[PDB]
């Protein structure tokens, strides 16, 4: 694809240059929010000292604003320079909207089918290595949907662009009870059904 | 809060006095697309899908991080040299897929609520440091401006091998060890 860009961080006003060690941390976050394709796009650039967000530009506002008393000198300075304001406003297109075109061709088309396995522990339905995050898991006892007795872990982010989730069922197995785990995911046209028979 | 279908960080920009060290990375829906190796001047995408089809010039990162260094000095003075507050990290260890002895799997160590972004993550196999088959993410951003980081250990599950994820952070009084073991 074409070379992608990030948000350009505005230059701060300055003209030049215990038991644990000291650390001074600076963070700048160029954040793009997308809703309903690119019909609703919002750019929020955040300027953070340590963990204190002290100034930000918000495309819904159109100018920089101070967040904490640490921010007025920066926000006033950045709002007075046309080379900072107009360039930041343009990033809604040059950064957010353009990069989204490459997300549409890669990240937003990534469909990894979930792996569904059943193992006793409480019956555990492991749904592993799927993407994107939207998933629906249901327990069934002989074509009867279980509503009580189901405990699911939160959605688990593996950090490698896959998710997993464990859905557990407190049950009493008899000789005729057949338990099935039903999983729905955008990578699947039809649900995955895995059976466990006592 | 801001509700949206998709959230991207087209610029997680980090610089800190300890080191000193920095980080430039892009995120989409909470996952890392790439980081820029500032020393080697290379864009390192986190999926082979991304390197084949996407471009990002590392010079954009080097330029932006140099600005962060300038901004940090300016706000250090403005804040009367207010240092970062150490947070207590949270560690969790789990496997990537259901464990079956003899079948290759992956141990995952999630170090959450990291601040400042300075941490040691070490895998122990039967009490000894293991670096073979080890990889990790960069620092991943959080909405409260702390970080999390995930380390991976590829391993062969066996009844005679136990593991620990050793995490060292200034917010901890001593190294934190989260233990993990197979089915039996």
């Amino acid at each position, epitope marked *: 694809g074409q070379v992608e860009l990030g948000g350009g961080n505005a230059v701060e006003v300055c003209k030049g240059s215990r038991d644990s060690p000291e650390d001074f941390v600076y963070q700048f976050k160029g954040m793009c929010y997308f809703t309903n394709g690119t019909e609703r796009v919002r750019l929020v650039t955040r300027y953070i000292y340590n963990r204190e967000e002290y100034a930000r530009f918000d495309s819904d506002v159109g100018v920089y604003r101070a967040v904490t008393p640490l921010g007025p000198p920066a926000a006033e300075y950045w709002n007075s320079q046309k080379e900072v304001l107009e360039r930041t406003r343009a990033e809604l297109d040059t950064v957010c909207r353009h990069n989204y075109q490459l997300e549409l061709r890669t990240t937003l088309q990534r469909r990894v089918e979930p792996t569904v396995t059943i193992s006793p522990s409480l019956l555990v339905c492991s749904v592993t290595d799927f993407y994107p995050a939207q998933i629906k898991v249901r327990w069934f006892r002989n074509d009867q949907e279980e509503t009580t007795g189901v405990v699911s872990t939160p959605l688990i982010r593996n950090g490698d662009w896959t998710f997993q989730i464990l859905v557990m069922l407190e049950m009493t197995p008899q000789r005729g009870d057949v338990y099935t785990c039903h999983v729905e995911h955008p990578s699947l046209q039809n649900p995955i059904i895995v059976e466990w028979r006592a | 809060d801001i509700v949206a279908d998709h959230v991207a960080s087209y610029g997680v920009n980090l610089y800190q006095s300890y080191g000193p060290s920095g980080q430039y990375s892009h995120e989409f829906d909470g996952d890392e697309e790439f980081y820029v190796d500032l020393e080697r001047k290379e864009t390192v995408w986190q999926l082979p899908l991304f390197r084949r089809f996407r471009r990002f010039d590392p010079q954009f990162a080097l330029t932006n991080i140099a*600005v962060l260094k300038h901004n940090l000095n300016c706000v250090i003075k403005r804040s009367n040299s207010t240092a970062a507050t150490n947070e207590v990290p949270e560690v969790t260890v789990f496997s990537k897929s259901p464990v079956t002895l003899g079948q290759p799997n992956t141990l995952i160590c999630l170090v959450d609520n990291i601040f400042p972004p300075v941490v040691n993550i070490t895998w122990l196999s039967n009490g000894h440091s293991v670096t073979e088959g080890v990889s990790e993410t960069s620092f991943l951003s959080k909405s409260d401006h702390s970080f999390f980081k995930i380390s991976y250990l590829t391993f062969l599950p066996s009844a005679d091998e136990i593991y620990d994820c050793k995490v060292e952070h200034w917010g901890l009084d001593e190294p934190l060890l989260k233990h993990w073991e197979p089915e039996s």
Partner: T-cell receptor
Amino acid sequence: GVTQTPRYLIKTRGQQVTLSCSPISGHRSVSWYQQTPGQGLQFLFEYFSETQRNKGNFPGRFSGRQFSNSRSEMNVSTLELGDSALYLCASSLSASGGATDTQYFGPGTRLTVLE
Amino acid sequence: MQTVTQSQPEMSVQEAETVTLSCTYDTSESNYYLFWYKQPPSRQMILVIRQEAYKQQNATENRFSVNFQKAAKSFSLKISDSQLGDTAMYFCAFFGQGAQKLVFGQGTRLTINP
């Protein structure tokens, strides 16, 4: 505007040279270029906030630096006859990361290297 | 000779007439800037025209204008009402927002005949 000194300079092979540049008032970025008839305009390096942000492909004997008021110097040690060139300084506002696209040049330094 | 191409080493034009200087470029950048510089015999590099990739409106500065064809990657400079003071070396320049290096073409020598 961008000012440079010396405008003209004669040196012999092996000597060193230090060139001075003062950017446009308020500009934070200074870029250095070498113009020869055989290679055209060749980028040396770019300085911002007293540090080198961007580098060309010149050998280590070509070096530069930038001071607290954003004035810049560049240096060429062990001068070669091929180093005879016009050495150009260009300044950019650089009020945000990446905004060095518009560069305004100084008059340049005419350096002649002789045996 | 690869990122910016000026295929005309020398160009001449009659005074008060119009001349067009050719410039094509090759890049993968999505956002970038295109320039023309005028270098008279004084060797002073003068910035004449600036064009932004995301502003498809052709840039104009009085007698100077460009024909920016983004899809063709062409950035020709038109000098209207050529003056004797337009005699100079003209350089086409490219600056990608990612690589952030100002790159110059080989240059085009323009002579205005009185």
